[PDB]
Amino acid sequence: KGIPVLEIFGPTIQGEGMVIGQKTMFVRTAGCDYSCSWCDSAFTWDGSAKKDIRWMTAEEIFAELKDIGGDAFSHVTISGGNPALLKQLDAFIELLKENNIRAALETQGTVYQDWFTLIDDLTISPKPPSSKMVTNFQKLDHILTSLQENDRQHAVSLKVVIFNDEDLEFAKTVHKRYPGIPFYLQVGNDDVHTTDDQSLIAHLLGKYEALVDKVAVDAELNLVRVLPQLHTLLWGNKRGV
Amino acid sequence: KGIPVLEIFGPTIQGEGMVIGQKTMFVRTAGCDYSCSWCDSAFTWDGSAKKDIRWMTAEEIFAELKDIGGDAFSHVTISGGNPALLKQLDAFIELLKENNIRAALETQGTVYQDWFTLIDDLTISPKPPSSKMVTNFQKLDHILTSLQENDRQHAVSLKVVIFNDEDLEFAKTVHKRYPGIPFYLQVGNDDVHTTDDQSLIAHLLGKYEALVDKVAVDAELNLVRVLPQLHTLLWGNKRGV
Ligand SMILES: Nc1nc(=O)c2nc(C(=O)OC[C@H]3O[C@@H](n4cnc5c(N)ncnc54)[C@H](O)[C@@H]3O)cnc2[nH]1
Ligand SMILES: Nc1nc(=O)c2nc(C(=O)OC[C@H]3O[C@@H](n4cnc5c(N)ncnc54)[C@H](O)[C@@H]3O)cnc2[nH]1
Ligand code: MET
Ligand code: MET
Ligand code: SF4
Numbered sequence: 001k002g003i004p005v006l007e008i009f010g011p012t013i014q015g016e017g018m019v020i021g022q023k024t025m026f027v028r029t030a031g032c033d034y035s036c037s038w039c040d041s042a043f044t045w046d047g048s049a050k051k052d053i054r055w056m057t058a059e060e061i062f063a064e065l066k067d068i069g070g071d072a073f074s075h076v077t078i079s080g081g082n083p084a085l086l087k088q089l090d091a092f093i094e095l096l097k098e099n100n101i102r103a104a105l106e107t108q109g110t111v112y113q114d115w116f117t118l119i120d121d122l123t124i125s126p127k128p129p130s131s132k133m134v135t136n137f138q139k140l141d142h143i144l145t146s147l148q149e150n151d152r153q154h155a156v157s158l159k160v161v162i163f164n165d166e167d168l169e170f171a172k173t174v175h176k177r178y179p180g181i182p183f184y185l186q187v188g189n190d191d192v193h194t195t196d197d198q199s200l201i202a203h204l205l206g207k208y209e210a211l212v213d214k215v216a217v218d219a220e221l222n223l224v225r226v227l228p229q230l231h232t233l234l235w236g237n238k239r240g241v
Numbered sequence: 242k243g244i245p246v247l248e249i250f251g252p253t254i255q256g257e258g259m260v261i262g263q264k265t266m267f268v269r270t271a272g273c274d275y276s277c278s279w280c281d282s283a284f285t286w287d288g289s290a291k292k293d294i295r296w297m298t299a300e301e302i303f304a305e306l307k308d309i310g311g312d313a314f315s316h317v318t319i320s321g322g323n324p325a326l327l328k329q330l331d332a333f334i335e336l337l338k339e340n341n342i343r344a345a346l347e348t349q350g351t352v353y354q355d356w357f358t359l360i361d362d363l364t365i366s367p368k369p370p371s372s373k374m375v376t377n378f379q380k381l382d383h384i385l386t387s388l389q390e391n392d393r394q395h396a397v398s399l400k401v402v403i404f405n406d407e408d409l410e411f412a413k414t415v416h417k418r419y420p421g422i423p424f425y426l427q428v429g430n431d432d433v434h435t436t437d438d439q440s441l442i443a444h445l446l447g448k449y450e451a452l453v454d455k456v457a458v459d460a461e462l463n464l465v466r467v468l469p470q471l472h473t474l475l476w477g478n479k480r481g482v
């Protein structure tokens with residue numbers, strides 16, 4: 001029943017996706033069924049921080065959020081890792097809704113949980129070929145079908161990270177497969193380890209413009225948002241922000 | 242019945258507000274009832290480009306959009322200037338909807354038009370004391386009341402530009418006055434004339450972080466998005482992008 005927690009920080013801003021810029025708290029869980037080659041939070045699954053895992057109850061996480069956040073937040077983003085691996089997260093999501101706190105979720109869309117229907121901002125991020133991951137579309141279909149059946153279409157978005165042209169073609173395939181779902185494109189980060197912020201920012205902004213220029217002429221990507229990682233532009237690869 | 246046009250460009254991305262990152266075309270009109278001290282598009286009203294005004298029909302604007310944009314767009318953003326000054330814009334907004342094109346609008350919220358109800362993404366931007374403008378709240382109440390009566394609440398947002406603490410207090414007043422409306426905070430641009438992009442980007446990112454740090458501890462700004470100007474981070478103060 002305990003929840004494996006690695007990070008609890010905030011208040012900060014959501015740097016990605018459907019609710020980008022939103023002031024929110026963060027709860028990063030441990031464990032991933034994926035092993036993406038460019039995972040910017042590899043410590044959640046690579047075993048390098050397994051000893052740092054704190055198994056907490058829903059009340060303990062909420063108390064710690066209220067502690068470091070005070071009354072200066074009404075939004076909480078649950079990430080990882082793949083939080084969808086944890087069924088016991090239901091007690092925490094319910095506790096948030098019972099305290100007038102809106103919840104967001106970051107998942108790659110492999111495992112479905114019934115507490116998905118309680119998420120106000122559900123971001124599903126299928127992984128492109130550059131992540132060396134293989135996408136199970138049957139599992140992705142089941143998740144999106146279940147969400148649409150519970151009228152959660154206003155709370156669900158698709159976000160694909162792009163590193164090259166191959167990823168962009170993969171993103172088009174996903175977008176065409178699910179026409180009604182709000183679609184997002186995200187700039188891929190090359191160096192998730194570098195400490196030189198100035199070079200990183202200039203590099204990512206260059207990648208952003210190159211992506212924008214490419215999508216601009218693609219007629220199959222008209223209903224698409226193109227966004228970077230704002231928190232990376234502000235603090236680089238720093239954790240806890 | 243002619244529409245005063247100064248800019249027609251795209252496809253690019255929406256760099257601000259509720260639909261930030263969205264691939265869209267731009268139609269910037271002429272004329273403003275405001276004279277904000279930090280207007281990043283002063284040429285639309287300061288009279289410096291009055292000779293460049295092209296009075297076009299709805300069909301001519303649409304034909305030019307289809308010309309430079311092709312079939313690589315499904316979204317059009319109408320800005321200025323204050324487009325709400327133009328009643329004859331109705332024919333153009335209708336023409337967009339009749340051609341499966343979603344329309345967005347940028348206005349400061351002074352003048353109301355009946356074609357507001359046809360806008361898919363209506364951004365209202367009340368001006369803070371730093372703009373040297375005085376906000377008529379009675380006019381702002383009428384606009385927001387009319388929109389809520391036609392169930393356009395899903396299509397309307399409030400966005401306040403912040404330059405200092407005084408603007409931030411003004412933003413809180415606006416947010417408190419309209420609790421149900423999605424609220425946005427935007428980083429103010431100091432130098433809208435500078436040509437040194439690298440210094441401008443580093444300066445605006447610093448202003449962004451300072452704004453985020455300030456909002457993070459404010460309990461009255463929980464349901465708030467904090468965003469910069471993405472197009473300024475990509476192309477600086479360049480026009481036509
Ligand atoms: N302020 C703030 N602080 C954070 O810590 C924070 N974290 C996240 C977050 O972890 O979301 C997960 C998404 O990140 C993607 N992702 C992984 N690796 C990536 C990479 N190398 N390049 C580009 N994208 C990558 C992944 O697809 C997933 O959808 C989001 N917003 C945040 N905002
Ligand atoms: N790609 C792309 N190209 C554009 O040309 C473009 N234009 C606009 C746009 O004009 O929106 C108007 C908003 O801009 C605000 N605004 C004025 N002056 C400002 C300033 N000095 N600093 C900070 N904000 C300012 C104003 O409040 C208004 O709400 C929006 N997105 C765009 N995206
Ligand atoms: C570091 S990614 C965390 C969320 C989830 N694993 C995803 O990829 O969407
Ligand atoms: C250059 S701003 C253009 C849109 C409108 N005048 C506003 O301030 O919101
Ligand atoms: S699914 Fe997300 S957390 Fe897991 S390895 Fe991929 S990017 Fe990292």
Ligand code: SF4
Pocket residue numbers: 273274275276277279280281282283285321322323349368
């Ligand atoms: S209302 Fe908008 S266009 Fe008019 S002066 Fe102010 S910022 Fe410029």
